[PDB]
Design a protein around this nucleic acid. Structure first.
Ligand SMILES: CC(=O)O[C@@H]1[C@@H](O)[C@H](O[C@H]2[C@H](OC(=O)[C@H]3CC[C@@H]4[C@H](C3)O[C@@]3(C[C@H](OC(=O)/C=C/c5ccccc5)[C@H](C)CO3)[C@]43CO3)O[C@H](C)[C@@H](O)[C@@H]2OC(C)=O)O[C@H](C)[C@H]1O
Ligand SMILES: NC[C@@H]1O[C@H](O[C@H]2[C@@H](O)[C@H](O[C@@H]3[C@@H](O)[C@H](N)C[C@H](N)[C@H]3O[C@H]3O[C@H](CO)[C@@H](O)[C@H](O)[C@H]3N)O[C@@H]2CO)[C@H](N)[C@@H](O)[C@@H]1O
Ligand SMILES: NC[C@@H]1O[C@H](O[C@H]2[C@@H](O)[C@H](O[C@@H]3[C@@H](O)[C@H](N)C[C@H](N)[C@H]3O[C@H]3O[C@H](CO)[C@@H](O)[C@H](O)[C@H]3N)O[C@@H]2CO)[C@H](N)[C@@H](O)[C@@H]1O
Ligand SMILES: NC[C@@H]1O[C@H](O[C@H]2[C@@H](O)[C@H](O[C@@H]3[C@@H](O)[C@H](N)C[C@H](N)[C@H]3O[C@H]3O[C@H](CO)[C@@H](O)[C@H](O)[C@H]3N)O[C@@H]2CO)[C@H](N)[C@@H](O)[C@@H]1O
Ligand SMILES: NC[C@@H]1O[C@H](O[C@H]2[C@@H](O)[C@H](O[C@@H]3[C@@H](O)[C@H](N)C[C@H](N)[C@H]3O[C@H]3O[C@H](CO)[C@@H](O)[C@H](O)[C@H]3N)O[C@@H]2CO)[C@H](N)[C@@H](O)[C@@H]1O
Ligand SMILES: NC[C@@H]1O[C@H](O[C@H]2[C@@H](O)[C@H](O[C@@H]3[C@@H](O)[C@H](N)C[C@H](N)[C@H]3O[C@H]3O[C@H](CO)[C@@H](O)[C@H](O)[C@H]3N)O[C@@H]2CO)[C@H](N)[C@@H](O)[C@@H]1O
Ligand SMILES: NC[C@@H]1O[C@H](O[C@H]2[C@@H](O)[C@H](O[C@@H]3[C@@H](O)[C@H](N)C[C@H](N)[C@H]3O[C@H]3O[C@H](CO)[C@@H](O)[C@H](O)[C@H]3N)O[C@@H]2CO)[C@H](N)[C@@H](O)[C@@H]1O
Ligand SMILES: [Mg+2]
Ligand SMILES: [Mg+2]
Ligand SMILES: [Mg+2]
Ligand SMILES: [Mg+2]
Ligand SMILES: [Mg+2]
Ligand SMILES: [Mg+2]
Ligand SMILES: [Mg+2]
Ligand SMILES: [Mg+2]
Ligand SMILES: [Mg+2]
Ligand SMILES: [Mg+2]
Ligand SMILES: [Mg+2]
Ligand SMILES: [Mg+2]
Ligand SMILES: [Mg+2]
Ligand SMILES: [Mg+2]
Ligand SMILES: [Mg+2]
Ligand SMILES: [Mg+2]
Ligand SMILES: [Mg+2]
Ligand SMILES: [Mg+2]
Ligand SMILES: [Mg+2]
Ligand SMILES: [Mg+2]
Ligand SMILES: [Mg+2]
Ligand SMILES: [Mg+2]
Ligand SMILES: [Mg+2]
Ligand SMILES: [Mg+2]
Ligand SMILES: [Mg+2]
Ligand SMILES: [Mg+2]
Ligand SMILES: [Mg+2]
Ligand SMILES: [Mg+2]
Ligand SMILES: [Mg+2]
Ligand SMILES: [Mg+2]
Ligand SMILES: [Mg+2]
Ligand SMILES: [Mg+2]
Ligand SMILES: [Mg+2]
Ligand SMILES: [Mg+2]
Ligand SMILES: [Mg+2]
Ligand SMILES: [Mg+2]
Ligand SMILES: [Mg+2]
Ligand SMILES: [Mg+2]
Ligand SMILES: [Mg+2]
Ligand SMILES: [Mg+2]
Ligand SMILES: [Mg+2]
Ligand SMILES: [Mg+2]
Ligand SMILES: [Mg+2]
Ligand SMILES: [Mg+2]
Ligand SMILES: [Mg+2]
Ligand SMILES: [Mg+2]
Ligand SMILES: [Mg+2]
Ligand SMILES: [Mg+2]
Ligand SMILES: [Mg+2]
Ligand SMILES: [Mg+2]
Ligand SMILES: [Mg+2]
Ligand SMILES: [Mg+2]
Ligand SMILES: [Mg+2]
Ligand SMILES: [Mg+2]
Ligand SMILES: [Mg+2]
Ligand SMILES: [Mg+2]
Ligand SMILES: [Mg+2]
Ligand SMILES: [Mg+2]
Ligand SMILES: [Mg+2]
Ligand SMILES: [Mg+2]
Ligand SMILES: [Mg+2]
Ligand SMILES: [Mg+2]
Ligand SMILES: [Mg+2]
Ligand SMILES: [Mg+2]
Ligand SMILES: [Mg+2]
Ligand SMILES: [Mg+2]
Ligand SMILES: [Mg+2]
Ligand SMILES: [Mg+2]
Ligand SMILES: [Mg+2]
Ligand SMILES: [Mg+2]
Ligand SMILES: [Mg+2]
Ligand SMILES: [Mg+2]
Ligand SMILES: [Mg+2]
Ligand SMILES: [Mg+2]
Ligand SMILES: [Mg+2]
Ligand SMILES: [Mg+2]
Ligand SMILES: [Mg+2]
Ligand SMILES: [Mg+2]
Ligand SMILES: [Mg+2]
Ligand SMILES: [Mg+2]
Ligand SMILES: [Mg+2]
Ligand SMILES: [Mg+2]
Ligand SMILES: [Mg+2]
Ligand SMILES: [Mg+2]
Ligand SMILES: [Mg+2]
Ligand SMILES: [Mg+2]
Ligand SMILES: [Mg+2]
Ligand SMILES: [Mg+2]
Ligand SMILES: [Mg+2]
Ligand SMILES: [Mg+2]
Ligand SMILES: [Mg+2]
Ligand SMILES: [Mg+2]
Ligand SMILES: [Mg+2]
Ligand SMILES: [Mg+2]
Ligand SMILES: [Zn+2]
Lengths: 159, 61, 144, 100, 185, 103
RNA sequence: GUCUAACGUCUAUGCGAGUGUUUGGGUGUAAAACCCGUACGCGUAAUGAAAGUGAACGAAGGUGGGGGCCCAUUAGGGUGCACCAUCGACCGAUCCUGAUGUGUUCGGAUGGAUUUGAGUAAGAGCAUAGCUGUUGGGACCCGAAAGAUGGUGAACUAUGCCUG
RNA sequence: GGCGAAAGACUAAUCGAACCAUCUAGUAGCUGGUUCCUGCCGAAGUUUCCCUCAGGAUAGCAGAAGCUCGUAUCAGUUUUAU
RNA sequence: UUGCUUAAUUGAACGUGGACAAUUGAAUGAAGAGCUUUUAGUGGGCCAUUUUUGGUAAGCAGAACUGGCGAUGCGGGAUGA
RNA sequence: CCUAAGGGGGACUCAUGGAGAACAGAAAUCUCCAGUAGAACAAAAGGGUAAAAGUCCCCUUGAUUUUGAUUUUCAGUGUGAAUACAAACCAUGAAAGUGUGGCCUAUCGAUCCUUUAGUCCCUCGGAAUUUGAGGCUAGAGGUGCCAGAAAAGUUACCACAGGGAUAACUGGCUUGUGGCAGUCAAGCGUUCAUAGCGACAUUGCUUUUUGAUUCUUCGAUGUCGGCUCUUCCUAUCAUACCGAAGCAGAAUUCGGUAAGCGUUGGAUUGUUCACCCACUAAUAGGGAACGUGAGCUGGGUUUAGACCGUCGUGAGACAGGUUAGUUU
RNA sequence: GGUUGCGGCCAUAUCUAGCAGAAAGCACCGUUCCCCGUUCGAUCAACCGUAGUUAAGCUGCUAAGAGCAAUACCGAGUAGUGUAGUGGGAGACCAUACGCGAAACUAUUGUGCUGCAAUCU
């Protein structure tokens, strides 16, 4: 007999973290979610109402609806050869703001401040990010660092 | 008799000939499922908003 | 396969220029079992561009037989000559992307003198794939 | 047996329908013979008209009330009003309807 | 061998000629094949393309739509171009004086345009008074009001029209359209 | 299963439109009338020759039935029906549980 | 892998809020061609089980895009059909409210509702033809073991009888 | 139906239901076959339902017709952040 | 702007007006992107590396990813899906 | 399965251990300390839970009403189940709040028909009244093969369409099993591991067993055995030449090269196999489509006739016994 | 800086054993008519701030403390793993090549930080 129930295979996924069981710290209930916010979904095993399905555990999406104790999140789920918009109702215990917004919103502010300062200075500044490039030339001083010559060591048994 | 029970072989090939395609995004998403109390009120705020803007342009004509 | 397609390497003995960053380096690492690559000398670049240099103009593979073709397609990037293009490639310039994408992938022949006894193993282990660094110049001399 | 997005049809061809196919090849021939018979009847009874005088009557039902068409015969009251006996009227090219 | 990043030997997927063998429709494309080839005016390239379209791709344009199109601000004397038939609308209370260039006019449309002081010219007459399509306004008919589109994309909870021959309470109204008869889709 | 003989639920009658006290009774299927059209059609179909004309169910699988409560409002006498889950045993207004007593 | 009846998509054509002459009538150089019209079919209104009711707040709506056209002068602005996403308005059903009134049980104004329709929102259809696809037909061609109706056999043979 | 000292035997080389003609071109998810050339594109044996398991429907894979547009913003890939 | 929300002049959503101009905010590629209708065949599969289950095992039976054969000739493995 | 084992609130803290108290003891009841849950939460298991979700107490019926959206299975159809709101009416608590059944993951059911409830509304079509009937909305009566026919057997008298998509021979992979052989050497062998043996282990070989599988053959490869005849293998029974011995002789046993050469006559049995009698130098074991049926024979098996026993109500069944049964 | 009330993160804050703690606060502490709750004013309820005490709670310090946290020329580029070859090996398995890279172990260091309001030697 095959078993494919709603919470099948969630033995470890829906567990609380080790030494992190019990009551929810109330910052979870004090956070404010607005329509358009990006939130990660991670199911709390101790709150059984409003739990996401195991598919959305570990997924990240956008809030589209705000209710008394829950938020609505839009997830794009792959079904065959296209994506389908899934609209999941989640209590805020299973939701956390995505930390990817605050870095990108910070890169926008930093770009704006430098650009307006080069404009103030009558100069130019380049803002496109670049991947790490190969390192330049350099000179190695040997004062205190004359090279030590190594050789492969013979075979030994240590038991 | 007895046959093959299940296999996902060749299924990712079939999904990637023309699919695994991201849906298009639009400036206004559909508001299906948003709270009815807000949605009823969002109707009156927009209709009234349209009234104020209509009068401002009717002056400027 | 997708990585090689994105490097415009869609046939055997096809050659392309890559500016080493981290993104393009990890790309080449993905294609490593199927490519031989290395650090090209200035003369190797010149020989490639002179003999097998073609441009992509309105999606067509056109021989670089006159500096006017190069000017008409890369003058907004300050390339007015075949030597401007070679200079922009060799000392990787601010417009390396446009200049290298305008260049159609080089279609080399097989080496005169052959490959090693078995190609598809790293150059370090006696094969041909992976980074050979300065011996790519000898290989291009064999194949171009 | 059922396939695609198509309308569901009711094609009543489960009997021996091919034994009961009437193809009207003789449309033109019967038209011509009808015309010749009609000419024959006219030359037989000339100059008396081939058509009896028909009354004018309202069409029944709520759908055809507005329309008026040719009836079958003039009522006995109508013929009485013009001083023609029905027995005599049938002999002078007038149609009678005892039912209306 | 090649690792093809796209399908090889693919036709463009656009009409390059009318499907029609009407000799007079191809004479107009011959005029606009020349115009699209030589004037650099974007109007002429659109007309040549529009002359290739099929019948369902050239919906009839009512004379009321042209009336509403002429009611745009600063459009009272623009020249209306309809690549197709312009039909009449007996629901209008009034029609302006207008110049309309079309492939065809219906009798009511032609009478009403000329009765109200307007002109009903063909597209070749247009190409002489406006070889670059200056001060024009192209009107296209409704493409999605066609009956066949009612049944396109039919499915559960899709709200389209079933393909059905008869209409009534006994025809596809019980089970699957009603919660008292099972479910509703 | 033990259900009290009274209950305070919503009354849908227009006069009440509120929770009233409702008498609880077990619903009983009425006697099948001989002039329901399906019985009229069934009797005509079975007549004559041809044998049994409609199917007869045999392959019983359920061992219970859904118990239905008839809730009649004491204010307006409007009846309401509530189905319960499948129970093998069911009493109305039985002896309430006594927790703590000995065997 | 056919023909036919009825159909889906696409395309060409005629006319177009209409369309279809051919049931029939006229006519004829006679199954042709030519001509005629009342009706009728489909379309032009939907929705509800039904009684029934029945489509403009507005320039027949607003927003973000939108080819083309207009003014410009890189840019920018105006106008923006078709079409896309979205929010509204209107008609029918359902539920709620229930004005003046009244065959005092009828009437249903007004204002609403995460409800609902194969609807409106300046018509798009009708008709002919072709390929392809659908269903019924023998149905791409050939093929059962069987079932039914009506008839012909006891010159073989089984059994009775008659005469040898 | 007959007939059977009984074998399901015999009933015109036909018998666990004769022969003749018709219904009848009986039906067949099963066999077999299915007729000229070249050009371009080009699969599936997987999902769900089915007295479903040699079959259908359904989605997918494929072709064809195109239509709206013309670099708009996409990717069987990398980088960075999370 | 609102008939929702706040003790509120607080907020929510959608807006008017103003500021930030081509390094408009990583790489690489892009025979361009988006969209629609309709229909065929198919719905027995098998193999190789690796992960892997039953089994002493099997040229056995069953799954995971990819690539193949099927549907494919050509050079090599003598011969061989 | 549950009127609470549902809902709300409140109070308390569980398993277990130590130290103590008449009868009283390992277990009765009482006390303190310790006690992260080592318990309890209907039922499988997992997750979850400590001023609680557990234990106890108080009050209750939200296990109620109208319909929409969503998640899982998914075709993004149905069913089941669940989630978050909208609009009511309520319960509880000082309150914030919570409550749309069971802490979460299983605990279930279409069309047609009937029955009940609701609206007391629409229709019975020439017009009314009242019965009756028919409509609209929600439940119930059920399909467990659970997307849901109404259903007992036999055929050894048999038929048809097919299938090597699938069994009964050979053949192919495997070699558990069967058979044969090694290595290590604790023991046996009067002493003495290895003359001859050899446990516990362990590595193999073979395809003369039986399994396992289902690749070939179902538009057919004649299925047992015997007779006849040829050939091949060696894991050698005899014969030749030799090595070893717990080889005095005789006999015997172990081994090497060795398949050149032979390996029988009979009673019973269809037999293969078996078992006896007897000769013999010896009466070894096997393969060749389990060699060999257009070579035979046809005793067995396996059509139809028939008998018995057991089984079956019966038609009939038996891989049980018996007899007769076309070898092109 | 101490202290109280309400807290955020929820052991660098916990556990065990000692010792210390000014001022204020907190606390133990006294009483039972009243509201209230118990077998028991022990808990809960109410009253007094009067009669007493820092003994306890609490706070801080001590401990090669247990536990916890952080760091690393610690272990270890080890185990494992993505990719490659007509590499090795009868096989079991192993080496190499381009990449990614633990856990335990060991050593060292640390033992709450802090928001709003009020108050104090
Ligand atoms: C004696 C007996 O046991 O046989 C009865 C038969 O007599 C009975 O016939 C009834 C007959 O049944 C039918 O014609 C079918 C109607 C619906 C189908 C089926 C039978 O009932 C189902 C099955 C199932 O529920 C039942 O089973 C119904 C039981 C029933 C009993 C009495 C009256 C009505 C229904 C679904 C819930 C829906 O209804 C349905 C889809 O299968 O209907 C007539 C009105 C009755 O007169 C008639 O009852 C009598 C007295 O004879 O039907 C039952 C199914 C049988 O079990
Ligand atoms: N009047 C009903 C029938 O109509 C038939 O004719 C119908 C068909 O010939 C023709 O079919 C058209 C089709 O060509 C066109 N491309 C699309 C259109 N929807 C179809 O019409 C269809 O829908 C209409 C209702 O809208 C039905 O009445 C009609 O039967 C059906 N064929 O449209 C006609 C409209 O009825 C026949 N004359 C006959 O069977 C009968 O008269
Ligand atoms: N530091 C680089 C790494 O990149 C990793 O992932 C990067 C890519 O490898 C990965 O790409 C995956 C691709 O592997 C997978 N096969 C398909 C998937 N659609 C891609 O996903 C990505 O692209 C989609 C749109 O295509 C976007 O939603 C998004 O940028 C990202 N999820 O997603 C990232 C690119 O955006 C991880 N994010 C993380 O380990 C780390 O950031
Ligand atoms: N444990 C942190 C998780 O790892 C994520 O991503 C980590 C891995 O998943 C990711 O691995 C990527 C892989 O996704 C991708 N498909 C292929 C890529 N080669 C891998 O990257 C690997 O190699 C690159 C250099 O080539 C290194 O920079 C990287 O550290 C290494 N893991 O590299 C990251 C190394 O930390 C994110 N870094 C982080 O936000 C997330 O929480
Ligand atoms: N209820 C019993 C049935 O009623 C029959 O007669 C009934 C019918 O004439 C009529 O019943 C109508 C019916 O026409 C119609 N098709 C359906 C409608 N729901 C019925 O209505 C009836 O039933 C509902 C249900 O509870 C009641 O609320 C209501 O008071 C009652 N009139 O009203 C009568 C009952 O008041 C017979 N009396 C009886 O033989 C039959 O079994
Ligand atoms: N030697 C083993 C195998 O034997 C096979 O041949 C057959 C025989 O060895 C053996 O057949 C036996 C038979 O020996 C015996 N005397 C009678 C038995 N009815 C037969 O078959 C029996 O065994 C087979 C195999 O498991 C199964 O079908 C079943 O258990 C049973 N029918 O099993 C095989 C199939 O029946 C293969 N043909 C051969 O290639 C292979 O070597
Ligand atoms: N041929 C091979 C061998 O011959 C052997 O033969 C046996 C005897 O015939 C022989 O014994 C001797 C023989 O050595 C010698 N050279 C000749 C003498 N006549 C034999 O004598 C033997 O046979 C005679 C006659 O029948 C008897 O009377 C006497 O009892 C018997 N010992 O030696 C064996 C002792 O029993 C055996 N049959 C056997 O080992 C084997 O078959
Ligand atoms: Mg629950
Ligand atoms: Mg299958
Ligand atoms: Mg299965
Ligand atoms: Mg040479
Ligand atoms: Mg080629
Ligand atoms: Mg319209
Ligand atoms: Mg909808
Ligand atoms: Mg019908
Ligand atoms: Mg339901
Ligand atoms: Mg009768
Ligand atoms: Mg009778
Ligand atoms: Mg009858
Ligand atoms: Mg009958
Ligand atoms: Mg029945
Ligand atoms: Mg029965
Ligand atoms: Mg008409
Ligand atoms: Mg219409
Ligand atoms: Mg209004
Ligand atoms: Mg409405
Ligand atoms: Mg409703
Ligand atoms: Mg009323
Ligand atoms: Mg509405
Ligand atoms: Mg046939
Ligand atoms: Mg027959
Ligand atoms: Mg029959
Ligand atoms: Mg007869
Ligand atoms: Mg005789
Ligand atoms: Mg008789
Ligand atoms: Mg017999
Ligand atoms: Mg005979
Ligand atoms: Mg036949
Ligand atoms: Mg191709
Ligand atoms: Mg079924
Ligand atoms: Mg099967
Ligand atoms: Mg079949
Ligand atoms: Mg087959
Ligand atoms: Mg098909
Ligand atoms: Mg199919
Ligand atoms: Mg198969
Ligand atoms: Mg098949
Ligand atoms: Mg095939
Ligand atoms: Mg190949
Ligand atoms: Mg070859
Ligand atoms: Mg070989
Ligand atoms: Mg409980
Ligand atoms: Mg309770
Ligand atoms: Mg509590
Ligand atoms: Mg423990
Ligand atoms: Mg324990
Ligand atoms: Mg809705
Ligand atoms: Mg669904
Ligand atoms: Mg569902
Ligand atoms: Mg389920
Ligand atoms: Mg529920
Ligand atoms: Mg309240
Ligand atoms: Mg509530
Ligand atoms: Mg409910
Ligand atoms: Mg079930
Ligand atoms: Mg039911
Ligand atoms: Mg019913
Ligand atoms: Mg009943
Ligand atoms: Mg009924
Ligand atoms: Mg009547
Ligand atoms: Mg009545
Ligand atoms: Mg069962
Ligand atoms: Mg079934
Ligand atoms: Mg099923
Ligand atoms: Mg048998
Ligand atoms: Mg016979
Ligand atoms: Mg087979
Ligand atoms: Mg073995
Ligand atoms: Mg041994
Ligand atoms: Mg000894
Ligand atoms: Mg076999
Ligand atoms: Mg054969
Ligand atoms: Mg033969
Ligand atoms: Mg043979
Ligand atoms: Mg030997
Ligand atoms: Mg010897
Ligand atoms: Mg020999
Ligand atoms: Mg003998
Ligand atoms: Mg014998
Ligand atoms: Mg054998
Ligand atoms: Mg044999
Ligand atoms: Mg032979
Ligand atoms: Mg023979
Ligand atoms: Mg034989
Ligand atoms: Mg012979
Ligand atoms: Mg025989
Ligand atoms: Mg015999
Ligand atoms: Mg016998
Ligand atoms: Mg016999
Ligand atoms: Mg027998
Ligand atoms: Mg005999
Ligand atoms: Zn009431």
């Amino acid at each position: 007999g095959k078993s494919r129930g709603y919470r099948s295979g969630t033995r470890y996924a829906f567990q609380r973290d080790f030494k992190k069981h019990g009551a929810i710290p109330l910052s979870t209930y004090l956070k404010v979610y607005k329509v358009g916010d990006i939130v990660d979904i991670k199911a709390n095993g101790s709150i059984q109402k409003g739990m996401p399905h195991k598919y959305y555990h570990g997924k990240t999406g956008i809030v589209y609806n705000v209710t008394k104790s829950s938020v609505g999140v839009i997830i794009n789920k792959v079904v065959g050869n296209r994506y389908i918009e899934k609209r999941v109702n989640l209590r805020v215990e299973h939701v956390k703001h995505s930390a990817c917004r605050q870095e990108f919103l910070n890169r926008v502010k930093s770009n704006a401040a430098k650009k307006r300062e080069a404009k103030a200075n009558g100069e130019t500044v380049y803002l496109k990010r670049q991947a790490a490039k190969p390192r330049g030339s350099r000179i190695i001083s040997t004062e205190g660092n004359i090279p030590q010559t190594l050789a492969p060591v013979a075979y030994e048994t240590f038991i | 008799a007895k046959s093959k029970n299940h296999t996902a072989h060749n299924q990712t090939r079939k999904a990637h000939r023309n699919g695994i395609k991201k849906p298009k995004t639009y400036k206004y998403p559909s508001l299906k499922g948003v709270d009815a109390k807000f949605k009823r009120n969002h109707r009156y705020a927009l209709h009234g908003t349209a009234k104020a803007l209509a009068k401002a342009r009717a002056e400027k004509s | 396969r997708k990585v090689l397609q994105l490097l415009r390497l869609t046939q055997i003995n096809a050659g392309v220029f890559v500016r080493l960053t981290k993104a393009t380096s990890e790309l080449i690492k993905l294609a490593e079992p199927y490519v031989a690559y290395g650090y090209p000398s200035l003369s190797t670049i010149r020989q490639l561009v002179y003999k097998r240099g073609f441009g992509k103009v309105n999606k067509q593979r056109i021989a670089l037989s006159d500096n006017a073709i190069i000017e008409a397609n890369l003058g907004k990037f300050n390339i007015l000559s075949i030597e401007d293009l070679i200079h922009e490639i060799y000392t990787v310039g601010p417009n390396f992307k446009q200049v290298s994408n305008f260049l159609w992938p080089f279609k080399l022949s097989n080496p005169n003198g052959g490959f090693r006894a078995r190609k598809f193993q790293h150059f370090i282990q006696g094969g041909d794939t992976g980074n050979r660094e300065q011996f790519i110049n000898a290989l291009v001399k064999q194949m171009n | 047996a059922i396939s695609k997005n198509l309308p569901l049809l009711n094609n009543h061809f489960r009997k021996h329908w091919q034994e009961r196919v009437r193809v009207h090849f003789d449309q033109a021939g019967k038209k011509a013979s009808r015309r010749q018979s009609r000419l024959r009847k006219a030359a037989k009874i000339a100059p008396r008209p081939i058509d009896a005088l028909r009354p004018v009557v309202r069409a029944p039902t709520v759908k055809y009330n507005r329309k008026v068409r040719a009836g079958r015969g003039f009522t006995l009251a109508e013929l009485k009003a013009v001083g023609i006996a029905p027995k005599y009227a049938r002999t002078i090219g007038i149609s009678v309807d005892h039912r209306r | 061998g090649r690792d093809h990043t796209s399908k090889q030997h693919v036709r463009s997927g656009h009409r390059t000629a009318p499907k029609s063998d009407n000799v007079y429709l191809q004479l107009l494309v011959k005029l606009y094949s020349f115009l699209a080839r030589r004037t650099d005016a974007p109007f002429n390239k659109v007309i040549l393309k529009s002359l290739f379209l099929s019948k369902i791709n050239r919906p009839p344009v009512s004379v009321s739509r042209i009336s509403r199109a002429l009611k745009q601000k600063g459009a009272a004397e623009k020249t209306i171009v309809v690549v197709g038939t312009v039909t009449d609308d007996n629901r209008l209370l009034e029609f302006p004086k207008a110049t309309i260039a079309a492939l065809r006019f219906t009798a009511g449309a032609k009478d009403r345009i000329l009765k109200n002081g307007g002109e009903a010219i063909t597209l070749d007459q247009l190409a002489l008074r406006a070889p670059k399509g200056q001060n024009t306004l192209i009107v296209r008919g409704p493409r999605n009001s066609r009956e066949a589109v009612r049944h396109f994309g039919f499915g559960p909870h899709k709200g389209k029209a079933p393909r059905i021959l008869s209409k009534g309470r006994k025809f596809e109204r019980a089970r699957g359209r009603r919660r008292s008869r099972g479910f509703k889709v | 299963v033990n259900v009290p003989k009274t209950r305070k639920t919503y009354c849908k009658g227009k006069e009440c439109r509120k929770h009233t006290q409702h008498k609880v009774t077990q619903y009983k299927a009425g006697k099948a009338s001989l002039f329901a059209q399906g019985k009229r059609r069934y009797d005509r179909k079975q007549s004559g020759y041809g044998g049994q004309t409609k199917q007869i169910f045999h392959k019983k699988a359920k061992t219970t039935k859904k118990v239905v409560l008839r809730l009649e409002c004491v204010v307006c006498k409007t009846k309401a029906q509530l189905p319960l889950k499948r129970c093998k045993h069911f009493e109305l207004g039985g002896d309430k549980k006594q927790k703590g007593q000995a065997l």
